[PDB]
Amino acid sequence: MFFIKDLSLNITLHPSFFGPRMKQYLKTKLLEEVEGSCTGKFGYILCVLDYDNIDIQRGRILPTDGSAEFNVKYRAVVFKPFKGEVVDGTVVSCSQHGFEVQVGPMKVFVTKHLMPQDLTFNAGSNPPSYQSSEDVITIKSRIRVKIEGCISQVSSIHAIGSIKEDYLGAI
Amino acid sequence: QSEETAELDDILGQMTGAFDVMIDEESLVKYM
């Protein structure tokens, strides 16, 4: 799910950037260190809103490092997954263990046990697929997945998906 | 070796310590 979250960061600036345009460098650091990053506490951070209106407090010089620590408050759109949520995505990889669905910046794993009994794994077909008398699942196919669990690390997030329940599967 | 050189409590290898040193954005834009 996508949220507009008010986040704060502690940036460090090397002494080589102490000039009239120091604020510009801090904005670049925020755009290069925040955007595209994954944080378990808040989830993926996609975009930073109000680029011009970023508030920067006075920097503090570290004793033995010489760099300045800047606390930057900004508004950014984030994607934090949750178990029990229903999301849509496209299958990107397949194997005996299970196929993976691309939900935004996250990859959902559908284990062989979680998928219905009817689905069977066949690798003779190129590419490999999960086939059921009704439908067939393969790369680039759109699948509706239910997140059954999420493990959020400080710098990474992984989740598992299930299509056992009704109204979940090929779209 | 460096250019620079049940009760609650405040040996930890930590610190000039009386006063901190901050950077000034108002002055940086003016010096140049």
Binding site: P15 | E4, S27
Partner: peptide, 28 residues
């Protein structure tokens, strides 16, 4: 600490024009 702070900053390839304020109340 300002003298050592700027000395380290200069040694780390910092431009030379001391834009620092002592956070005792902040004073420049």
């Amino acid at each position: 600490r300002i003298l050592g702070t700027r000395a380290l900053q200069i040694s780390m390839n910092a431009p030379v024009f001391i834009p620092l304020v002592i956070r005792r109340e902040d004073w420049s």
